[PDB]
């Protein structure tokens, strides 16, 4: 079946980087886009942007421009999200979500989520 | 949630077996402009699950108790025959003419006496 399996939880301090993976199986990886969605604990879903698995080119939502990087390793069917210069407010579950054909704006299959926790000391 | 691009009521309620409808208000540049409105169901600790796409289509395996429609700039999800397991958060989304996706703020659906 189609499955998106993400890497495990992360616990980081402000200023650090983290790279999260999303490994796709059960369909041709480069045939469909990948979207990224963030959800802070207790809060709603936020669209971060998408990456084309044909070109590798990422398009970021306005709120996610600068510190966030979408990338791929197509040889292992994997999409990655890196967050640089982590801040306390980056604590969230990050989901990869497949762009359903034809255009990718319906998210038909979701990864299980990766919790990134940034500890501030208080 | 109340400041989201698409507006959903923060909460909704029904009783077992009842039908309930929840709305998702956008603009003519998104819900009212295109037929790429989706609804996602999310249980605690789980990823969102697609339940309605392209306004009214249902993925295989999703019960026909879930249905979607829109009128003007407002999309609506209806859950008929409410079951205890339908208690969850529901999010709408839409494509926009800016080549973005917007989300609603989510509705917590409670099943009274579930």
């Amino acid at each position: 079946q189609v499955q998106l399996v993400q890497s495990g939880s992360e616990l980081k301090k402000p200023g650090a980087s983290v790279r999260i993976s999303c490994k796709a199986s059960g369909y041709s990886f480069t045939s469909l886009s990948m979207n990224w969605v963030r959800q802070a604990p207790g809060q709603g879903l936020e669209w971060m942007g998408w990456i084309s698995t044909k070109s590798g080119d990422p398009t970021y939502a306005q709120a996610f421009t600068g510190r966030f990087v979408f990338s791929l390793d197509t040889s292992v069917n994997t999409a990655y999200l890196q967050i640089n210069s982590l801040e306390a407010g980056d604590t969230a579950v990050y989901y990869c979500a497949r762009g359903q054909p034809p255009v990718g704006w319906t998210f038909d299959y979701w990864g299980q989520g990766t919790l990134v926790t940034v500890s501030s000391g208080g | 949630g109340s400041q989201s691009a698409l507006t959903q009521p923060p909460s909704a309620s029904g009783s077992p077996g009842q039908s309930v409808t929840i709305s998702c208000t956008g603009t003519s540049s998104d819900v009212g402009g295109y037929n790429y409105v989706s609804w996602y169901q999310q249980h605690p600790g789980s990823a969102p699950k697609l339940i309605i796409y392209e306004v009214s289509k249902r993925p295989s395996g999703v019960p026909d108790r879930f249905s979607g429609s829109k009128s003007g700039n407002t999309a609506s999800l209806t859950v008929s025959g409410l079951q205890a397991e339908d208690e969850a958060d529901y999010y709408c989304s839409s494509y926009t003419s800016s080549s973005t996706l917007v989300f609603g703020g989510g509705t917590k659906l409670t099943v009274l006496g579930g």
Binding site: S31, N35 | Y95
Partner: peptide, 6 residues
């Protein structure tokens, strides 16, 4: 008019 993401 809808952008094809991929």
């Amino acid at each position: 008019d809808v952008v094809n993401q991929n």
